[PDB]
């Protein structure tokens, strides 16, 4: 028992990371096979940002302008290339480390463990829902660009994530693996702000059904409700509308519990509308939803 | 900016786990230089349980009985031997990824990471406090047996805690590395239930000046409180009192912020007689206590 947000174990990142210097700024990389790959904002000076050609920095630069630490080892760095936003360096040594792994890119809603590293160090690990306004709400510091976010599936890891900037209400944007942002953000200096937000209704539901399986039953009802007058109530408090689709993604947590989508459908409107009146779920005061229905299957097998 | 329930990288741990199998009970076990650790009540039967003399049920074992697998590689079991509640397994090699590390013993009050394992394989990795009543809420299945918490420090693995049970409410007990229990405990069959908890203050006031580092301000006035007149509320509101050495403890994130510890402690008052109405503190509608003051200075650095 017990539901915690928890993150996948990092090691398998762990052994990719090695920092990359380019003048004065230091951030973090991925070594993977003989490419490292970084945010392409390495090669900026302050004032570049403000409006930078990146062809025409990028074309000022040379192989023995970047260096690449792994451990306590250099990496020689033997050709250059911008991809979208991140740089990728081809080195002379391929990474005895590398794990198996994919470029995916995720959608609003899912879920992936972040591995903040300064200096190419790990530091931390959790986990973050990528937000509907295609941010998300991490913990980063000044250096921790190029810190990753993934999944892992068996011996797998899927990477999602490279981190670029943080926006000016504290989320963070970033771009896929191939350098292409999540969401309208830029890496050039601008007055870019995220854009209005909603809660990940699919998630609410698959966090109460982690609730049930876990004893908190206090919120549940006799009640049911249809599926439209449920998206009345979800439009009206700023939750994304629930598909049929997302009805049938939670068929296993409603089968375990024996409670209807609907029916906990129906008890998430009387919380929307009610409040907790007190109460918590879950530990939390407040309607969760970076948990997925995966997260929540993973996470609370057989405990029935 | 931005503050996360954040874990160690925990790939050094990784390194360490191995799948312990005794008759038909499998769990995990910690391998570092020759040894294996994990919990005694691997060579239990359900039936032992109820009343085992661990003594007489060891002395009718022998190595062979051991089935020790790191990954897809058999480890030789050449001496077996119990220390309190955990058993110690020599095999005949030792693990080449033996971190640097200690067995320490914790506080309650104080934070670890967590990484649960099923069959020696690492599942996932999350944050967790000792309670003031010695359990820890954690996330456990049948199986998870003999993962461990633990913190790192530069290079060196600090191993606080193994799994061993869950209390029917669903929190957790364990020993240390020692295999001494946290609390009141036993790996037995009883009505040991878990005690009476209380909040742990010094953390609440740390992860007060964690949200005033990320710019939520709203809970701070201009009143202070003497520390007596505090510790009159804290008793009342079952908070764990505040000592001395607490406000010494959190001096620095009072100096980052320029917010006296007292007058944090009137904010905290006052937020316990009134709540929150319907405002949160970084992203929680309720008071949170298992961020140390030290977890808050690692993850704030420089943000001020
Ligand atoms: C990389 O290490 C670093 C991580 C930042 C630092 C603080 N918290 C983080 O997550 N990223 C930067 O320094 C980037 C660089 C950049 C990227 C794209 C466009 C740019 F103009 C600059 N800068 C920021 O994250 C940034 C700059 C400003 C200015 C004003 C308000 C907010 C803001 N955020
Ligand atoms: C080890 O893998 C396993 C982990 C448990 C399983 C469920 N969630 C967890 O964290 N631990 C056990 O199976 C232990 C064994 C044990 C240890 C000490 C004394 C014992 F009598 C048994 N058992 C339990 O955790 C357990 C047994 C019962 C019975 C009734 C109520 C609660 C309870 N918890």
Known sequence: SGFRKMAFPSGKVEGCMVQVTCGTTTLNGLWLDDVVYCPRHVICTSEDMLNPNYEDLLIRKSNHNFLVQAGNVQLRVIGHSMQNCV??????????????????????????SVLACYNGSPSGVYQCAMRPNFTIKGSFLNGSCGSV??????????????????????????????????????????????????????????????????????????????????????????????????????????????????????????????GMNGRTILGSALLEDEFTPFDVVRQCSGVT
Chains 1, 2 share one sequence.
Not at 87 to 111: C, E, H, M, S, W
Not at 182 to 209: C, E, H, K, M, S
Not at 251 to 273: F, H, N, R, W, Y
């Open 87 to 112: 740089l990728k360096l081809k080195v002379d040594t391929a990474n005895p480390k590398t794990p198996k792994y994919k470029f995916v890119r995720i959608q609003p809603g899912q879920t992936f």
């Open 149 to 274: 976010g993934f999944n892992i599936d068996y011996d797998c890891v899927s990477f999602c994530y490279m981190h670029h900037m943080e926006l000016p209400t504290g989320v963070h944007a970033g771009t896929d693996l191939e350098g292409n942002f999540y969401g309208p953000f830029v890496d050039r200096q601008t007055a870019q702000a995220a854009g209005t937000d909603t809660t990940i209704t699919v998630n609410v539901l698959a966090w109460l059904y982690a609730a049930v399986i876990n004893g908190d039953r206090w919120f549940l009802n006799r009640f049911t409700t249809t599926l439209n007058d449920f998206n009345l109530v979800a439009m009206k408090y700023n939750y994304e509308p629930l598909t049929q689709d997302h009805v049938d993604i939670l068929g296993p947590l409603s089968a375990q519990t024996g409670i209807a989508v609907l029916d906990m459908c129906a008890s998430l409107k009387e919380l929307l509308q009610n």
